[PDB]
Design a protein around this ligand. Sequence first.
Ligand SMILES: Cc1cc(-c2c(-c3ccccc3)c3cc(Cl)ccc3[nH]c2=O)on1
Length: 303
Amino acid sequence: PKYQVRWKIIESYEGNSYTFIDPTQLPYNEKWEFPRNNLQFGKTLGAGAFGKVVEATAFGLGKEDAVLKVAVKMLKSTAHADEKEALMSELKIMSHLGQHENIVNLLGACTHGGPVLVITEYCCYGDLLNFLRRKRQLSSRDLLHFSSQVAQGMAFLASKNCIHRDVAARNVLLTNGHVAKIGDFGLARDIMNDSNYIVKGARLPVKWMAPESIFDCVYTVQSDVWSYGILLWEIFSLGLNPYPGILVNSKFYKLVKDGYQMAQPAFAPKNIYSIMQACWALEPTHRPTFQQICSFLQEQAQE
Ligand SMILES: Cc1cc(-c2c(-c3ccccc3)c3cc(Cl)ccc3[nH]c2=O)on1
């Protein structure tokens, strides 16, 4: 099992943002550095076969000396060169994107003083999946907000030529006031035992992957939109597992490619469900954009 970073920066031209550089190639911005001797370890929020991320309190973080709670990504001791570097490619990728309200942002790092620790935001209500599974009183709108919020952050990663490649409710946290925030929680989850990741010789959340990625290992922002739809499903199905009952295998594959789509969820308005269908279009060029999806969920100003 190889660590491997999910998030990636690609080269897009005609897009409304040009990629002049590939961060992971060199950058190291020492302006994210923070004194590990001012970080207090809380409990372990989660962990997997490569590392863990634990709660902690940072004294004097930022230009405003705040003393807020944080989540420290970190690797295990068993770690080796490769792993150690993958972690850094994710920091740089983080330091490049910048900070958006609907993304688990970067707050600091400790590249010097020993092991490298990535200090990210800390969201108090946990991940979106588990949240829906415990609140089955959510309002039809509560759901409609997470969709636009998630859609917003994904609009952002898109406006930087950054692909996710793993968009799923399990990768959406819920911070203060229940605001969403996409991210990658690879460290904190144990992929070796999560049946949502099928083996590839790597581990890929197939039921979420676009057909173009399952068949031709092609990852575009449009691949992301498809998975995003798979996410709207999880939201309105209040946490069901994609393709309920269906097993990921040879038959499954022929189904998705042949245009099969998941039936409408019980709580999804017809329009919203119509977003899933578009996102699931078989041809990438016909799927919407996270911005159109963003604007459309907006048009629902009907309230
Ligand atoms: C119960 C729970 C969890 C969490 C948070 C994270 C988490 C831990 C374990 C599984 C899924 C997500 C998390 C993960 C990473 Cl990689 C960066 C930041 C971050 N922040 C949090 O707040 O909050 N509450």
